[PDB]
């Protein structure tokens, strides 16, 4: 039971599985699109330092995986490089096959080191971790990443109506995830 | 992992002494190095830290003692160097160098004695 | 921003006594790990729990420790001759960039 969005002539209403309305016409399964949209574009606060407040660590949570095939430009990535006072890794290395994503303008890339009290890292507002066409419930290390959810698309027919330069500024953190946070910016 | 403390001795009031740990047994460049000073028949104190080159080498310091030692390290060498300038009174102690937890393996010990 | 212990414990052999340190929400309570030491008279310490209740190879299983809310309790059962020591622990503070907090000490007799 996860909302299935179907196009009508340019006009969007989610389909309702449960009863049977045949108009709706799929012929084939390249019809079939998932989709990835940006946090951002609803209007939330960018800022570093309140984008942050919305990760916590958590143990006892197995991470989970799912792919997406379009995304769309991200103004803002992320880029996490946290240890902890003595001089550990907090977050996992980045598995076999899970890249940035492709396109952001601006990648904040902050060091530094923290408490780090979770085995996992994720998102307190249920969204997702955008990589390239790989969206996660948590954070890796050194990968750069935007935030986003995913939805579900039945395309129309026609093929033709449906479907580079980036910067680092770098920050350095002390006391990262806790009530008062330490930043420079270089 | 043997971790010995040299180079060290009483200084006068205004005096500069440098002190020295050599660490052997384990991978030097890696780990990150802390300097802890305890005050004679007193409770432990944290002098400051050094962190991996990888990570950018930068250093911190206590309160008390910011902008009076300098902590840094070679590689090569495998050696931890504090440098103590401006040592006025109530400096005296043992200084010991520790490495990252887990294992922190403690040193023996250098006897710091300002005389006046 | 110094986290506090008691000045000394006693007990008779064979009991078990706890020794306390307390934390502070930026200290112990906001999620940094609690380190023991073990110091014996003219000897450098030697670390005794690692992490909050872990310990490193080599030391008797007698020793134990656990975390309530922003304090941390370090249980040793069993006294024996040989448990004469100063004990102390260790955290880091978040509100002195990240710099090592160390407790205050106490002097075991039994």
């Known amino acids: 039971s996860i909302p299935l969005g179907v196009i009508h002539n340019s006009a969007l209403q989610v389909s309702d599985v449960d009863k049977l309305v045949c108009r709706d016409k799929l012929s084939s399964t390249n019809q079939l699109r998932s989709v990835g949209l940006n946090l951002e574009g609803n209007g939330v606060a960018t800022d570093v330092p309140s984008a942050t407040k919305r990760w916590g660590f958590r143990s006892g949570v197995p991470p989970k995986v799912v792919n997406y095939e379009a995304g769309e430009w991200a103004e803002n990535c992320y880029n996490l490089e946290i240890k902890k006072p003595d001089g550990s890794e907090c977050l996992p290395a980045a598995p076999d096959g899970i890249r940035g994503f492709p396109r952001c303008r601006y990648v904040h890339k902050v060091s530094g080191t923290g408490p780090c009290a979770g085995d996992f890292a994720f998102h307190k507002e249920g969204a997702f971790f955008l990589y390239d066409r790989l969206a996660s419930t948590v954070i890796y290390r050194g990968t750069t990443f935007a935030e986003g959810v995913v939805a579900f698309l039945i395309l129309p027919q026609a093929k033709k109506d449906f479907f580079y330069y980036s910067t680092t500024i770098r920050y350095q953190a002390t006391g990262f995830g806790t009530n008062e946070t330490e930043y420079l910016f270089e | 992992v043997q971790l010995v403390e040299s180079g060290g001795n009483l200084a006068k009031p205004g005096g500069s002494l440098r002190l020295s740990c050599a660490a052997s047994?384990?991978?030097?460049?890696?780990?990150?190095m802390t300097w802890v000073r305890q005050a004679p028949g007193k409770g432990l104190e944290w002098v400051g830290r050094?962190?991996?080159?990888?990570?950018?080498?930068?250093?911190e310091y206590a309160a008390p003692v910011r902008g009076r030692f300098t902590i840094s390290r070679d590689d090569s060498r495998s050696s931890l160097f504090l440098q103590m300038n401006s040592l006025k009174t109530e400096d005296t102690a043992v200084y010991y160098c520790?490495?990252?937890?887990?294992?922190?393996?403690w040193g023996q010990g250098i006897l710091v004695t300002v005389s006046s | 921003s110094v986290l506090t212990q008691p000045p000394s414990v006693s007990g008779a052999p064979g009991q078990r006594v706890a020794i306390s340190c307390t934390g502070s929400y930026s200290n112990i309570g906001a999620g940094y790990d609690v380190h023991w030491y073990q110091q014996f008279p003219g000897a450098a310490p030697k670390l005794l729990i690692y992490?909050?209740?872990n310990r490193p190879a080599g030391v008797p299983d007698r020793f134990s420790g656990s975390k309530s809310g922003s304090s941390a309790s370090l249980v040793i059962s069993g006294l024996q001759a040989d448990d004469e020591a100063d004990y102390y622990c260790q955290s880091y503070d978040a509100r002195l960039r990240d710099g090592e907090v160390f407790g205050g000490g106490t002097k075991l007799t039994v």
């Open positions: 050094i962190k991996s080159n990888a990570d950018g080498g930068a250093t």
């Open positions: 520790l490495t990252p937890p887990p294992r922190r393996y």
């Open positions: 047994g384990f991978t030097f460049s890696d780990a990150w």
């Open positions: 992490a909050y209740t």
